[PDB]
Design an enzyme around this catalytic site. Structure first.
Site, PDB file in Angstrom:
ATOM      1  N   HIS A 163     -36.041  36.247 117.437  1.00  0.00           N
ATOM      2  CA  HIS A 163     -34.849  35.413 117.346  1.00  0.00           C
ATOM      3  C   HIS A 163     -34.562  35.073 115.892  1.00  0.00           C
ATOM      4  O   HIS A 163     -35.419  34.520 115.197  1.00  0.00           O
ATOM      5  CB  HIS A 163     -35.030  34.136 118.172  1.00  0.00           C
ATOM      6  CG  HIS A 163     -33.797  33.296 118.264  1.00  0.00           C
ATOM      7  ND1 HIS A 163     -32.558  33.824 118.556  1.00  0.00           N
ATOM      8  CD2 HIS A 163     -33.611  31.965 118.103  1.00  0.00           C
ATOM      9  CE1 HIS A 163     -31.661  32.854 118.569  1.00  0.00           C
ATOM     10  NE2 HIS A 163     -32.275  31.716 118.299  1.00  0.00           N
ATOM     11  N   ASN A 187     -29.945  26.585 114.824  1.00  0.00           N
ATOM     12  CA  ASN A 187     -29.913  27.610 115.852  1.00  0.00           C
ATOM     13  C   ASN A 187     -28.457  27.986 116.136  1.00  0.00           C
ATOM     14  O   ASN A 187     -27.518  27.418 115.570  1.00  0.00           O
ATOM     15  CB  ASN A 187     -30.647  27.122 117.103  1.00  0.00           C
ATOM     16  CG  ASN A 187     -31.052  28.261 118.024  1.00  0.00           C
ATOM     17  OD1 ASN A 187     -30.663  29.403 117.817  1.00  0.00           O
ATOM     18  ND2 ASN A 187     -31.842  27.951 119.043  1.00  0.00           N
TER      19      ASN A 187
HETATM   20  C1  LIG Z   1     -31.371  37.219 119.054  1.00  0.00           C
HETATM   21  O1  LIG Z   1     -30.247  36.943 119.882  1.00  0.00           O
HETATM   22  C2  LIG Z   1     -31.874  38.640 119.248  1.00  0.00           C
HETATM   23  C3  LIG Z   1     -32.326  38.883 120.694  1.00  0.00           C
HETATM   24  C4  LIG Z   1     -33.049  40.194 120.882  1.00  0.00           C
HETATM   25  C5  LIG Z   1     -34.434  40.257 120.797  1.00  0.00           C
HETATM   26  C6  LIG Z   1     -35.096  41.465 120.936  1.00  0.00           C
HETATM   27  C7  LIG Z   1     -34.386  42.625 121.161  1.00  0.00           C
HETATM   28  C8  LIG Z   1     -33.012  42.575 121.252  1.00  0.00           C
HETATM   29  C9  LIG Z   1     -32.346  41.368 121.115  1.00  0.00           C
HETATM   30  N1  LIG Z   1     -32.972  38.925 118.325  1.00  0.00           N
HETATM   31  C10 LIG Z   1     -32.960  39.944 117.456  1.00  0.00           C
HETATM   32  O2  LIG Z   1     -31.975  40.651 117.263  1.00  0.00           O
HETATM   33  C11 LIG Z   1     -34.252  40.186 116.679  1.00  0.00           C
HETATM   34  N2  LIG Z   1     -34.232  41.511 116.085  1.00  0.00           N
HETATM   35  C12 LIG Z   1     -35.247  42.374 116.261  1.00  0.00           C
HETATM   36  O3  LIG Z   1     -36.122  42.259 117.094  1.00  0.00           O
HETATM   37  O4  LIG Z   1     -35.158  43.389 115.374  1.00  0.00           O
HETATM   38  C13 LIG Z   1     -35.491  44.692 115.898  1.00  0.00           C
HETATM   39  C14 LIG Z   1     -34.222  45.405 116.291  1.00  0.00           C
HETATM   40  C15 LIG Z   1     -33.790  45.396 117.612  1.00  0.00           C
HETATM   41  C16 LIG Z   1     -32.617  46.036 117.977  1.00  0.00           C
HETATM   42  C17 LIG Z   1     -31.859  46.692 117.031  1.00  0.00           C
HETATM   43  C18 LIG Z   1     -32.276  46.709 115.717  1.00  0.00           C
HETATM   44  C19 LIG Z   1     -33.449  46.071 115.347  1.00  0.00           C
HETATM   45  C20 LIG Z   1     -34.473  39.097 115.615  1.00  0.00           C
HETATM   46  C21 LIG Z   1     -33.367  39.103 114.577  1.00  0.00           C
HETATM   47  C22 LIG Z   1     -35.826  39.245 114.948  1.00  0.00           C
END
Ligand SMILES: *[C@@H](O)[C@H](Cc1ccccc1)NC(=O)[C@@H](NC(=O)OCc1ccccc1)C(C)C
Length: 220
Positions: A163, A187
């Site tokens: 997140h 948030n």
């Molecule tokens: C926040 O809404 C979002 C929710 C989410 C978590 C996990 C997977 C998808 C969506 N969190 C993030 O976007 C998360 N990013 C992340 O895990 O980076 C890896 C990534 C996933 C998908 C596409 C590109 C990179 C936060 C920002 C750490």
């Protein structure tokens, strides 16, 4: 460094927004950090378009409502030469085709700075730069129902963040356990969540929830 920092008192921070049922926290973190740095530069606080990032920053590695990274968002604004305001490109909580219009761009950046993965380094950045984009492990029922106080979740991971959020300051408050330091975190779950949409996350407690693990800000 200062013992207490609150960039909201300096005018760097927009009101709390709501990402809805879309995995776009990364875009709200990025806009928040860019909103602060644009204010630092121009003295004008303008809300920026998360929908712009969701729709258009695919080529930098983001995946819309299926996740993304703030660094990728900062890269898009640089490569794209701009980012529309929130009023011109409002938030729909769904991924759509890109509708960026440079005439309504209100923000630019020339890259981004990744902060070392130390809470001390993050403190230095918040004290001197402004709001910082961070990633935390928010995947716990305790985080959903947080109301006030310093948030500490023993089962939080320092390595599995899910997140993106915005550190707008840090401070202290006396507590039962004498763990009194906290990051002031904005948030994007609306103002009904937490304390007006804000949370105080345990600071200097083994990089709690990975708050220092993926910190960065745009260069403006
Ligand atoms: C926040 O809404 C979002 C929710 C989410 C978590 C996990 C997977 C998808 C969506 N969190 C993030 O976007 C998360 N990013 C992340 O895990 O980076 C890896 C990534 C996933 C998908 C596409 C590109 C990179 C936060 C920002 C750490």
């Amino acid at each position: 460094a200062p013992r207490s920092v609150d960039w909201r008192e300096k005018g760097y921070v927009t009101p709390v927004k709501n990402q809805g049922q879309c995995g776009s926290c990364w875009a709200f973190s990025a806009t928040g950090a860019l909103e602060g740095q644009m204010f630092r530069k121009t003295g004008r606080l303008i809300s920026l378009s998360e929908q712009n990032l969701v729709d258009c920053s695919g080529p930098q590695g983001n995946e819309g409502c299926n996740g993304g990274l703030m660094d990728y968002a900062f890269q898009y604004v640089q490569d794209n030469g701009g980012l529309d305001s929130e009023e011109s490109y409002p938030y729909e909580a769904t991924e759509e085709s890109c509708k960026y219009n440079p005439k309504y761009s209100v923000a630019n950046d020339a890259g981004f700075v990744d902060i070392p993965k130390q809470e001390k380094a993050l403190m230095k950045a918040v004290a001197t730069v402004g709001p910082i984009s961070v990633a935390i492990d928010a995947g716990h029922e305790s985080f959903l129902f947080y109301k006030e106080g310093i948030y500490f979740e023993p089962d939080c991971s320092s390595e599995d963040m899910d997140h993106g959020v915005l550190v707008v300051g840090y401070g202290f408050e006396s507590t039962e356990s004498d763990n009194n330091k906290y990051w002031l975190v904005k948030n994007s779950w609306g103002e009904e969540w937490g304390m007006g949409g804000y949370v105080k996350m345990a600071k200097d407690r083994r990089n709690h929830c990975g708050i220092a693990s993926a910190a960065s800000y745009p260069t403006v």
